[PDB]
Amino acid sequence: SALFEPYTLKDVTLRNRIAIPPMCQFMAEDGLINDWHQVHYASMARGGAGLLVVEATAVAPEGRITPGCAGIWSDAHAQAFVPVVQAIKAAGSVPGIQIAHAGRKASANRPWEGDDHIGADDARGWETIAPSAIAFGAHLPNVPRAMTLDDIARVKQDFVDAARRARDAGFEWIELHFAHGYLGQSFFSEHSNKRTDAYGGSFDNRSRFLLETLAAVREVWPENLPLTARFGVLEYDGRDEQTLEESIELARRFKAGGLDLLSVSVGFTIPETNIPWGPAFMGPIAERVRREAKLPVTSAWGFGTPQLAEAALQANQLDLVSVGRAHLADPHWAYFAAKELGVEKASWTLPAPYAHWLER
Amino acid sequence: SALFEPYTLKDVTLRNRIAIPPMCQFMAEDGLINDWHQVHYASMARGGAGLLVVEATAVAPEGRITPGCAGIWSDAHAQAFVPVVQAIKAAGSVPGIQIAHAGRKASANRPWEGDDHIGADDARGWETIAPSAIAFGAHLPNVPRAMTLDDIARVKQDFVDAARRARDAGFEWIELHFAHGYLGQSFFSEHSNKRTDAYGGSFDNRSRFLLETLAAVREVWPENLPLTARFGVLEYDGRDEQTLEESIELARRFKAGGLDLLSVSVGFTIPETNIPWGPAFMGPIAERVRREAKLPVTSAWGFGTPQLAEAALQANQLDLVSVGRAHLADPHWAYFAAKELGVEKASWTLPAPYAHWLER
Ligand SMILES: Cc1cc2nc3c(=O)[nH]c(=O)nc-3n(C[C@H](O)[C@H](O)[C@H](O)COP(=O)(O)O)c2cc1C
Ligand SMILES: Cc1cc2nc3c(=O)[nH]c(=O)nc-3n(C[C@H](O)[C@H](O)[C@H](O)COP(=O)(O)O)c2cc1C
Ligand SMILES: COCCOC(=O)/C(=N\O)C(C)=O
Ligand SMILES: COCCOC(=O)/C(=N\O)C(C)=O
Ligand SMILES: COCCOC(=O)/C(=N\O)C(C)=O
Ligand SMILES: COCCOC(=O)/C(=N\O)C(C)=O
Ligand SMILES: COCCOC(=O)/C(=N\O)C(C)=O
Ligand SMILES: COCCOC(=O)/C(=N\O)C(C)=O
To answer: Could you say which residues bind FMNH2 here (chains A, B) (predicted)?
Structure first.
């Protein structure tokens, strides 16, 4: 089975092609993770996935999505991740982390607590920042503060500091969150970037914040550990052909800047879209990015059955299959997939105290 | 769905009828549990089961089955369970513990490390004790030492001390391990008990160790928390009708002695048996014990599908359905069962950071 072939990138070898993508838990307090995360991540890692990318972790307090988001903006925040890193490793999985800045989507309620921008009378809210003073709209009406050149320098340094902290905590895989309408995505998109300086307008200018952040992180992230990013390559906004061509060109420049793998996603930059949700719908798009930018890729959003994941790998559409929600349903999903795909000794996808008994 | 109706026993209310029965992990060192158990138990409790009975925990070092078995023979051992108790309660499940003494089946290798008695030349092993100096046979050939009267007094006090510690550590449910051919079961069975003193021979004498241990534990275990036991009520040894009749009579004496619920199992006292393994095969036996001894019961050994579990409850064969191996496969099995049985808001069997997304 292709899903259960190992994968080597730089000095890191994953035991299979199942990746757990970053999934916010909204359970942190003042950015500090706790026993929710410790058990959540350790259990999924024991489930058998080869790579576990920890949830969007804010590089600065105002870069959290919600008051429940994890942060890594101080050394104390980074030290809190050390037992998560070590528990993922102890399970035989590879610990990764997505470092993030929510941009204009920040200062929002948890999804089961309204999912909307926090009210200005609520003591939990904060001022958001973005390329331009333009609101997402819909359930996120708060207008962000337009960043100055000094803000751009500071946020870039925050990504650098976060990458250095993640390195020292023992993460072996880093993902820059340039997707999903948060800060990085919003610099790239003409929907949200109306700037008239070096960081808006042309393709080079809109790419500049993302390329400069990648280059600054590259200075401190080890050359022998995978340096990756998540990027929304189209919006389903009626501009898909031109947007995908530009996004693929940016992927070429990411590769020239030392990126090892691209997590291919959807932009979610504005609400006025028509995303064609369906099983493995990102397959053909990820395949095109992979082939045209000549870069390894993963994707998500509907690959969460064993046969769909296997098919995407056999078709060379993906190098790793990211399986998110199925691992919330079943933290041992990788074992379930090994059983369904007829892997020999499938129960030994799990550690011995489970594997021995599920073999019979 | 009967499976998702709450259950109240003494002052304890379980949110559904799904119980996770004790399942040895063989991962402790010198009796002390560790990060294996912490994540293992916390993840299963978050999965939605109403009651989680922690694995067979030895009341004395020689009462471990293996060198990997958990123990509670000192206050330091008991304090190590506190974070497990806390994590089970934090998930909304009820923490229980099975306290145990392996008797003549002690000093054995882990199941994936030979599953047999440790050799006499192997320094990891220890002398075993039992009612009589007679081996189980087969893969457990070691002849135990016949217990002295002082041994009997000491082991009873060890059960008391273990129950006292479990109480003070915050367990809300206790299970005396009188099943599966270990010490207590071997006092009851004529196969293993050849004693000629007050603890062997007659039905009263063979019952004596179990009744005296129950009474001694009853003195330190709170009135308002369920006091339960696991007991093998037949062997499938060709003596089933007579053995079941005597076992039900003992269950009546357990009830008179304050037992609140009986976990009905098979004796496993000797290897020369013909156990008719199959789906829900214990259903009719558990029902007969429940009805004739007028005690609430649980059972296991093949109820691990949602429909089999639901059927056993609707037929009033069980009060709680114990689902073991399916929870090793999927720690969120209770959520899987809620979906299959069409429970409304089935995803909210899980905590919010999962439930919100699995509801869609
Ligand atoms: C609860 C939850 C949290 C998520 N958090 C993140 C995140 O922090 N960063 C990110 O890039 N994507 C995040 N996502 C998107 C997922 O990584 C993934 O793309 C999505 O769940 C689709 O894959 P799936 O169909 O296998 O679930 C999250 C998704 C969910 C359901
Ligand atoms: C790994 C494992 C450990 C077990 N440990 C115990 C134990 O410590 N005490 C006990 O009474 N039964 C123990 N059992 C038996 C189970 O509690 C249960 O009766 C058995 O797994 C059958 O239920 P199931 O079909 O739902 O798995 C264990 C079973 C397994 C597979
Ligand atoms: C305390 O155990 C942490 C996780 O340990 C495992 O998952 C494991 N075996 O149990 C291996 C070899 O990976
Ligand atoms: C509608 O938004 C979908 C894309 O955004 C995400 O997946 C995400 N973080 O990247 C979270 C926390 O939801
Ligand atoms: C399926 O694993 C093979 C044997 O499993 C069992 O029957 C069992 N518990 O379920 C024990 C403790 O022996
Ligand atoms: C509200 O979620 C219900 C599940 O319980 C928890 O939250 C939890 N552990 O279970 C911790 C340590 O946060
Ligand atoms: C073949 O024996 C089955 C009955 O014994 C058990 O289930 C048990 N403990 O009670 C363990 C640890 O296996
Ligand atoms: C989860 O079921 C509802 C659909 O929501 C999503 O697709 C999603 N992630 O999978 C996010 C972050 O919005």
So the answer is: 22, 24, 56, 98, 230, 301-302, 324-325
Q: Are strands B12-14 and B7-9 parallel, antiparallel or unpaired?
A: antiparallel
Degrees to nearest 5, angle at CA B98 with B52 and B1: 30
Residue B286: how many CA atoms within 13 Å on its side-chain side?
Answer: 29
Encode B293-303: b = buried (16+ Cβ within 10 Å), e = exposed. bebbbbbbbbb
Q: What token pair was written down for B73? A: 């023979």
The amino acid sitting at A189 is S
Question: What is the distance between the alpha carbons of residues A329 and A294, in angstroms, rounded to a whole number?
Answer: 34
Element (H, E) at B257: none
A111 and B356 in contact by Cβ < 8 A?
yes
SS3 B213: helix
Question: Using the beta-carbon criterion (under 8 Å), do B330 and A336 form an inter-chain contact?
Answer: yes
Q: What is the resolution of this structure in A?
A: 1.5
Residue from A16, A44, A46, A335 whose mutation best tests the ligand 3 pocket (most atoms within 8 A of CB): A46
Query: Could you tell me which of B234, B229, B230 has the C-alpha nearest to residue B275?
Result: B234
Those residues whose C-beta lies under 8 Å from the C-beta of residue B41, and which sit 6 or more positions away, are: B52, B54, B84, B87, B88
Which residues have CB under 8 Å from B279's CB, separation 6+?
B302, B305, B308
Q: Which class would CATH give A2-359?
A: alpha beta
Determine the Cα–Cα distance for residues A209 and B4; give it in Å rounded to an integer: 53
Which is nearest to B14 in space by CA: B268, B285, B319?
B319
Is the separation of the CB atoms in A42 and A84 below 8 Å?
yes
